[PDB]
Amino acid sequence: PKPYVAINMAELKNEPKTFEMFASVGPKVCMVTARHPGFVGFQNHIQIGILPFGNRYGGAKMDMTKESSTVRVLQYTFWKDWKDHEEMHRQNWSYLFRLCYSCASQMIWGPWEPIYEIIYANMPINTEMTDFTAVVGKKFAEGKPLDIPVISQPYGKRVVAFAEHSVIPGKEKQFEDAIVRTLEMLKKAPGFLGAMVLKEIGVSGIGSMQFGAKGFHQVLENPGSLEPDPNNVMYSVPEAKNTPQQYIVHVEWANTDALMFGMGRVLLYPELRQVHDEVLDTLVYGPYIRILNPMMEGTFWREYLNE
Amino acid sequence: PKPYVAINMAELKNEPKTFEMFASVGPKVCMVTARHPGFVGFQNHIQIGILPFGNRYGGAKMDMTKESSTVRVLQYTFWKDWKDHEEMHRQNWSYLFRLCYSCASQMIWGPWEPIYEIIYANMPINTEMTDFTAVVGKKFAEGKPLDIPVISQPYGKRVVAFAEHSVIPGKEKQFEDAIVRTLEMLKKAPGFLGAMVLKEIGVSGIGSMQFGAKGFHQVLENPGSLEPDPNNVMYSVPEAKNTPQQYIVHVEWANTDALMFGMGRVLLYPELRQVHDEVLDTLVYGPYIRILNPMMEGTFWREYLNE
Amino acid sequence: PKPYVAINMAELKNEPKTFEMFASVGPKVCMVTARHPGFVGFQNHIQIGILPFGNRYGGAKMDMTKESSTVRVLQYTFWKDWKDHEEMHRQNWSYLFRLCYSCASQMIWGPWEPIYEIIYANMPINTEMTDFTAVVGKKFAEGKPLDIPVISQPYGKRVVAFAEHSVIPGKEKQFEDAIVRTLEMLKKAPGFLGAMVLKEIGVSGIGSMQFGAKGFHQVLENPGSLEPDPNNVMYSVPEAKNTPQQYIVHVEWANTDALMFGMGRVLLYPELRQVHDEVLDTLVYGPYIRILNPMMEGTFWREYLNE
Amino acid sequence: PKPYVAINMAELKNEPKTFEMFASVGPKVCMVTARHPGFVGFQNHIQIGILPFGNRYGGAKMDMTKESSTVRVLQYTFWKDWKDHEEMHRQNWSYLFRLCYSCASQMIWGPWEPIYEIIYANMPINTEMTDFTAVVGKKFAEGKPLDIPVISQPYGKRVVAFAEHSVIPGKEKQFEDAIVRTLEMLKKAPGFLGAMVLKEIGVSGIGSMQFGAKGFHQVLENPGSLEPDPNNVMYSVPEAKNTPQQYIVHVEWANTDALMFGMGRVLLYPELRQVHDEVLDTLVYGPYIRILNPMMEGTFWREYLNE
Numbered sequence A, B, C, D: 001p002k003p004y005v006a007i008n009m010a011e012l013k014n015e016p017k018t019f020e021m022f023a024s025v026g027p028k029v030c031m032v033t034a035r036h037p038g039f040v041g042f043q044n045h046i047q048i049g050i051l052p053f054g055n056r057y058g059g060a061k062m063d064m065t066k067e068s069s070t071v072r073v074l075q076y077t078f079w080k081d082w083k084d085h086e087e088m089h090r091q092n093w094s095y096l097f098r099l100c101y102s103c104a105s106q107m108i109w110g111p112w113e114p115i116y117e118i119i120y121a122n123m124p125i126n127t128e129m130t131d132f133t134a135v136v137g138k139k140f141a142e143g144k145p146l147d148i149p150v151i152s153q154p155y156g157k158r159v160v161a162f163a164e165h166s167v168i169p170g171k172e173k174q175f176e177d178a179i180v181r182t183l184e185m186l187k188k189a190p191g192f193l194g195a196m197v198l199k200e201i202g203v204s205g206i207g208s209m210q211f212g213a214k215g216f217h218q219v220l221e222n223p224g225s226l227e228p229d230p231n232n233v234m235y236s237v238p239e240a241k242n243t244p245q246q247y248i249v250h251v252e253w254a255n256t257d258a259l260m261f262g263m264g265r266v267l268l269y270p271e272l273r274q275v276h277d278e279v280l281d282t283l284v285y286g287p288y289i290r291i292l293n294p295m296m297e298g299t300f301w302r303e304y305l306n307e
């Protein structure tokens, strides 16, 4: 079934110490999150750059890692029920807060953790290049060659287009209908590895370290080993849902060239351009497209997705 | 009276070429904007850093300019009526678009131009250190020594705390009452040069280069000398207003130490801390505090503010 | 169906500034061209070298990019009707001219844009290495394993042999019959990714910036933002068709070794040599073979080709 | 059928001289071992690092070869009956001892040669990337597409997780049942190339150069060309079997990322975590996981395994 998605976002100093902490602390956070039976996996990204759209963002390029002073992370966690995410945070708060807070020395902005419903998904299971022979054998044995997926390699060996959209109030249905039509046509592009549309349902105060006054002071005053009061979050997840409605159009690609020209198909192929124009007419903001590297992941979220 | 504020936000490459364009293109944009009689001035900022709040943002510091790969600009223009801004853009679109678009080669994100109303202001006229003798003489001659302001030096010779807040729906009145009480007490801090509270009323699509499909393609395909259809903006300013409600708490300071410990007064002075706690209990996001340098400005906006 | 092909040819300075402009301006031109419903895609090449034919061109090699002072581009655009190309140029002249003229600072020769009919095509859809599993599954499910193509990777991950021929008047049918027989046999060579034969039908004056006196002066005098009179082109496309008849034999290969020995099969394999000798007997000029890299492309042109 | 496994373990100086001897002496030892008809192949490893388990072993990393002062080798030989190994050593003692003893100048610890039975195996035949087309063709021709293996590349082109476990006496059956259930679920992880469970049955005294007093002196006093008395081993293989019972869980992976996150599936995927917890409850020691490179091997041992 379709899981819910929590995306923890932060910006940190682009230096070796940061990536060393990703390597030691990141796995610990994921192991704690996996204590909850509603957890069905994760996909953690670093932003490597920005799609320049010609020279609309002429100061950007798809890989800015060599020059950037910061690194943005976008950590997707997947949940049977979005309420499972909220319960997990509170049930394991002592570990989670102390782990997450240890990243403070590297932090410039965040954490900020919106929650999403998936309204469309065409996403395959991940496979390594070593797996495809067995995958093909099995699908033919089952008499379902149509279910043989493209090879979507895990652990940093593909790239993601993270396309931000916000929609004019009242035009949500037009956006959703048109973007689904767009993505159903987009899958013809070479190197297309899947797409999904995420629709914001709210924001996790606790995941964003956004408490009332009491918790705020506890965060600011923390030596690193004392939990803020987890009951001091002052808003529920839906209370923080944004209007204009926010969406993420998440599209995966074999490589950054396939991404650039593939995403570009909605501009370069007249038939698809006409369909995608219906998306563009609904927007308050976007499309703004971040280029992401899915480095650390629990690929079994796609097994749950596709059952 | 209190003007409306349009804040054009962008992120650009941190390199000499960017600042060379600020120097050449910036004044031209301001001269075009001054064609409209509703224009009452401007205050243009570059972000120099982020308030670390101890080590809550431990990767940040108040001056990050030597290390940062990007520069964020926040260009305030002040307007008698917010519709004056929208009218100005359209009446002068040929000049404005071509000027603004010439920055494309340096752009990483933006432009994004929310519009605000000022709901609280305690902001003095700017004066240079050469002026105070005459200011004092004049106020005494008028029998109004209480009207003698602090010395708030223009053109990069003071600093700004730009504090982002978003508020739980239904808690706006508590936020507004508490932040005003806070700022009324904060003005006792040494080096305090003024404060105002901005409340978002919407977003300028045309100022954000956010069009329908037609205008989007014209922007992407532009050689630099052809205007997108200015009538192709698909939403009014209020249609893009965010919920949760967004605010900016803008506080000016003599120097960054006065900023750090002065803003810190809401955490360090128990009586004020109790008042400011009422602000904190209402928040979805924040406070996140950017440190800004007000470099290029039309100081006469404060003459309008203060009659 | 078979589209018509326009090939925009130019020679530019081989320096980073040139490739920076390819990256920013190139996509803009393609997006403008895609405004026309007759546009079915594109395949844009840079020449990387010349086939030396042993040491017949002993000063040449298949990759001369490290030493060359110039770069030659060959930009294929594909059209339902060649008249669509002419209409597109005129309907979007303000954008197209200003964009294309921006390349002037780098130009040494060109642009020159002949138009071609495709008289033979054996060209597959492009696929990335990630795609083949799904392609195979799909074709077997449809009961068409014979329609499973070789893997022709897009975006610079294969090479093109661009073979120029001009034919003795009266020998066009002998050439055409012989070259088709040759290419039908050539497809047995390892790494063969497809071939097509292009026959010149004329030249686009407007695409070649070739006007009468009025337009010529407007081009020479242009500050960059003023269109030459598009009605000042003095000849139709067919009026410029060359005699001796010109052809391009376009053959794609997995890599330059496969190209060298694969194209060499018409010299090294006695059965094929006898067939290709019938081609050679018809020539005024050629074969002269440029080695091309298809870097930027709209791969859906092959979808139109293959229906 | 399942062969027995002798694993000769040693630690040597990490310097070119050591690897030069691997290259010269290694093949000779294997050729001597192949004199015995019970020999069914071999798989020789060097340890490249240690799995850090987050920062549980924070001083370790998966590839420590650039910094390490030593190299650990783990040489697997496979046998129809474990007595074949003991017989092979004695029948060829003159050659084997002199060859093995020539490594003395590089040795820091070892040799130590436990013997194991395989109690669980899901291990494919090795194939190179050149082979898979023929493998697939053959399996389909035989009507057994389910028998098509993943591509497990020989000769250092994959990696091994070597997971040490010792089990509380009386809890062996719980361990064995739980680890098999774990590995049956683990095979879903991307890049999984196979797993087997080895259960220690004893230690080869002669393979470990562990003699009585007489043989010990002959070893210490050896000029290199005189055999210790092979009859002076004072214990049989089963007499040296350890209690607590020792096991090796041997899992093969496409690459070290697939290893890290794949092995991590038993911690990160709640359903699998619950199963693997039953393993953890039985342990005296472990899991301690060595990262191995299977460099030199006789791949036909898997042909015996799989008939």
Ligand SMILES: [Fe+3]
Pocket: A006, A008, A077, A085, A089, A113, A204, A207
């Ligand atoms: Fe979370």
Ligand SMILES: [Fe+3]
Pocket: B006, B008, B077, B085, B089, B113, B204, B207
């Ligand atoms: Fe504006």
Ligand SMILES: [Fe+3]
Pocket: C006, C008, C077, C085, C089, C113, C204, C207
């Ligand atoms: Fe053209």
Ligand SMILES: [Fe+3]
Pocket: D006, D008, D077, D085, D089, D113, D204, D207
């Ligand atoms: Fe042995």
